[PDB]
Design a protein around this nucleic acid. Structure first.
Ligand SMILES: Nc1ccn([C@H]2C[C@H](O)[C@@H](COP(=O)(O)OP(=O)(O)OP(=O)(O)O)O2)c(=O)n1
Ligand SMILES: [Ca+2]
Ligand SMILES: [Ca+2]
Length: 325
DNA sequence: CGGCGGTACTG
DNA sequence: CAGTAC
DNA sequence: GCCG
């Protein structure tokens, strides 16, 4: 469906360069531009046509036409030499751009330098230890196996527990970066307490190997960690689990499915219509002072299904595969 | 030009 | 609070 | 980077 693949391919490189350098807004504009380019019903044939597309302005149109007519993008040949290294360091889970810059500034140029000389948080050490595993997208069959491991451990405490793999898996992609499992109960009550029990059950199976984010003191809806399927040669994989009350399930699912750019656009649109959208609920506009500052949430508008959220936002419903932005 | 999603942990 | 993540 |  992407009729501008040669253009978007080269735009994404520049976008990634801006991203690993910490120019997050520039990268955002690029992301919206590239998404708009991939959804266009036709290969772009002129500057004027490109400019008429939302998300694309003069500066982006210049590059689009440059790639269209020459087949190349000169700016790519002028990208800083630090960028491949900053990208290398950014590929470590737990390490972002500030950290990458700092490491580069300290002279580090390889994962080996990071291993032997760099100061690493617990999360960064886990990310470094499983660098290759976490960087490799898994086949969705493996994601299925992981999801059903979690589901099997969950429904053992309560067979009525609903478990849905979200993220790229739910959007139907052939490969997944990590497994995203949402859990709830139509009951409305028996979703409570299952967090500790599920985590313990998965730990005793030897399924969970590392924890990145899990605040267990709190009787907590989110877990970020690492798992590995039983059997020889199995890779470590990133696993994220959310447990939500049924009344929020639709917004949770929607959030979890994404994609992230889809979520940002949808929340922006909600904001323009005097509403607020989060993983918890679709609500009315947040409460503000004389100053523009927010001081309180808006009133929750009940949403049993994703379609209800689309409805209350005045949007045509889209299946998960149509949210793959 | 200023704003750019809404949220949550870790240390 | 800065950084990072979903 | 784009948009209003
Ligand atoms: N900045 C972000 C990152 C993620 N998400 C949400 C939407 C995503 O779909 C979901 C899962 O995040 P992932 O990092 O797992 O991204 P995907 O599953 O969509 O793709 P991938 O296969 O690369 O993991 O969380 C979001 O709202 N905002
Ligand atoms: Ca994922
Ligand atoms: Ca994830």
């Amino acid at each position: 469906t992407n009729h501008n693949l040669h253009i978007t391919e080269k735009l994404e490189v520049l976008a990634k360069a801006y991203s690993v350098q910490g120019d997050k807004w520039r990268a955002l504009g690029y992301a919206k531009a590239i998404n708009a380019l991939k959804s266009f019903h036709k290969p772009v044939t002129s500057y004027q046509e490109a400019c008429s597309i939302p998300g694309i302005g003069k500066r982006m149109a210049e590059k689009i036409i440059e790639i269209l007519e020459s087949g190349h993008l000169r700016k790519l040949d002028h990208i800083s030499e630090s960028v491949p290294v900053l990208e290398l360091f950014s590929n470590i889970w737990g390490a972002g751009t500030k950290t990458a810059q700092m490491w580069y500034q300290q002279g580090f140029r390889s994962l080996e330098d990071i291993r032997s000389q760099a100061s690493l948080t617990t999360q960064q050490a886990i990310g470094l230890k499983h660098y290759s595993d976490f960087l490799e997208r898994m086949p969705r069959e493996e994601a299925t196996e992981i999801e059903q491991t979690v589901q099997k451990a969950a429904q053992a405490f309560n067979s009525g527990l609903l478990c849905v793999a979200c993220g790229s898996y739910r959007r139907g992609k052939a490969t997944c970066g990590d497994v995203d499992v949402a859990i709830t109960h139509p009951d409305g009550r028996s979703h409570r307490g299952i967090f500790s029990r599920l985590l313990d059950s998965l730990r005793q199976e030897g399924f969970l190997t590392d924890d990145l984010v899990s605040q267990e003191e709190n009787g907590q809806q989110k877990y970020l960690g690492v798992c590995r399927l039983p059997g020889p040669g199995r890779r470590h994989r990133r696993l994220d689990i959310i447990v939500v009350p049924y009344s929020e399930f639709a917004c949770a699912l929607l959030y979890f499915t994404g994609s992230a750019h889809f979520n940002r656009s949808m929340r922006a649109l909600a904001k323009t219509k005097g509403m607020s959208l989060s993983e918890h609920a679709l609500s009315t506009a947040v409460v503000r002072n004389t100053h523009g500052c927010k001081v309180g949430p808006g009133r929750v508008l009940p949403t049993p299904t994703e379609k209800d959220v689309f409805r209350l936002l005045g949007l045509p419903y889209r299946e998960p595969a149509e949210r793959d932005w």
